[model samples]
Target chain A: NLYFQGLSPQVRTAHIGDVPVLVRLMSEFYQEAGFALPHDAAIRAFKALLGKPDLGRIWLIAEGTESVGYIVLTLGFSMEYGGLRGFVDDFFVRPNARGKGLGAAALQTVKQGCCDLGVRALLVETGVYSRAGFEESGRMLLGQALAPPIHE
Target chain B: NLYFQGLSPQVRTAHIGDVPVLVRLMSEFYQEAGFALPHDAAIRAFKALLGKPDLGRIWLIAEGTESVGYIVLTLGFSMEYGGLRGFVDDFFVRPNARGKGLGAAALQTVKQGCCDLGVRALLVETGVYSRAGFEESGRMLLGQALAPPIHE
Candidate 1:
């Protein structure tokens, strides 16, 4: 089996059906963050996210016979930033799927999607400790660091 | 002075001249939360918010003097909860006016506005530590907690 490099629209829409998987993954991702949403509530939140008019697309990584990672991009606008912006609301890669460049590939997918959609900027929020990887990925894909200031 | 309560259309529209006072009051209200937005940004944001078709309503409070407190109610909807909801985005009572129940009066003004506009629920976000007074005020006014879990 082959490692997929990016996401297509069909794959993006179909990923909605993987709500349970995404919620489970996020639960582990945020384990120490003091917030543990019930799986059903997570599903409900995902449904709400999917129903948003400006929700852009999603991408998932499949390794041979198993699925391993995902990301979600939502569309927004900022006059301060001067145009259309894409927000990376959720991003995660399973522990087993790390170090294989799938995270980088996912970033590329989001970058290309933003360009295709004519987005002028992309922004995301992440913990301070996790900022380096995201900044590196953002610079690699979009040629600039688009991280906004965090308020504690 | 007699106290009065009403909805958005019932209250007069805030002119450009009122922007400064509004920003000053909101800045004070949000100061302890570390979200003390700049006056100019607050003015711009308030204007933009007012421009949205169903975005918000401004409530003015007075007692034989200039406006002493205000509440801004923004229109929002929750599919999970169903029907229209109102978000009390900005609320403030001047330092000299706090002990007189002006905050509660301002909220009552907003509540009436929400009811007139067909809002089925009201919500607001405040810092867990800094929100004690507002939480008590909300419970007293609404007869229950009006805040929902915030996604961090």
Candidate 2:
């Protein structure tokens, strides 16, 4: 399929109703990656992406009936690449689910979706995907806060 | 004045009519950076970005009506940052025009506009901006092309 239905239903397009599940999974994902996420901000962010499909897609991973992981793909534009690109902003499989190959399948599904949508490049920041066809472009991400950090 | 009319008129928003100048400057910028940009793709990209204001803004730097540089800022979103972000995709000043403070002024102008637009973070890849309030987040950019290279 074209990813609207997911590769084989193990990965499905997350909806507004899936926000709680997403937030929970995301909390775990970020925690394991060493960051604390603001609960309210997490809710708002998930809702924003769910409402705006043009922004990207979130897919929930499952093992038959229980959810085990999720993936976040965000749209981006690149003039050097000539048009649209994508960022695999987040991808995680629960600690127990790590060796089941779900993560690899999830990436394949998303890569296919990106191709179908005409995105010329797909980017990620982690070694998991880097080994799965994501190349090192020798570019580093740098940042500056335009606003003060939220202390909650 | 919020970057609409530009800061002191030295940095102004570029429009479709400024495509040629943008393409030329961008070509030179890429050349110095050790890359060969496709001319046709450059023209198309400038037009695409100029027509879509929400995507971001491109400002042409001028010295007494003679354009000397340009800057590109593209909009992005980050859940960790809590909302919209910006990438200072490209920033350049002509070799002859360096050391006169035009580059710094352009960044300030764009930063002000970013704050006004509610963009919470501004990012750049070069050391010039890293010293101008942009911080190191310890994250690297990685990518993989989904499509075959266009070898025209």
**Per-prediction DockQ, in order?**
0.03, 0.56
> How does each model score on lDDT?
0.53, 0.79
TM-score of each: 0.46, 0.88
Please write out the lDDT profile of model 2 over residues A4-43, one tens digit for every residue.
4543558877899999988888888878867777788889
DockQ class, candidate 1 = incorrect
Off by over 4 Å in 1: A1-152, B1-16, B30-37, B127-152
| TM-score result, candidate 1 | 0.46
Cα deviation in Å at residue B105, candidate 1?
1.6
Tens digit of lDDT per residue, candidate 1, span A30-143? Answer: 563555546665666566556654445656666765567777776543322223456565677778877766676676677677777767556554322133123422211111
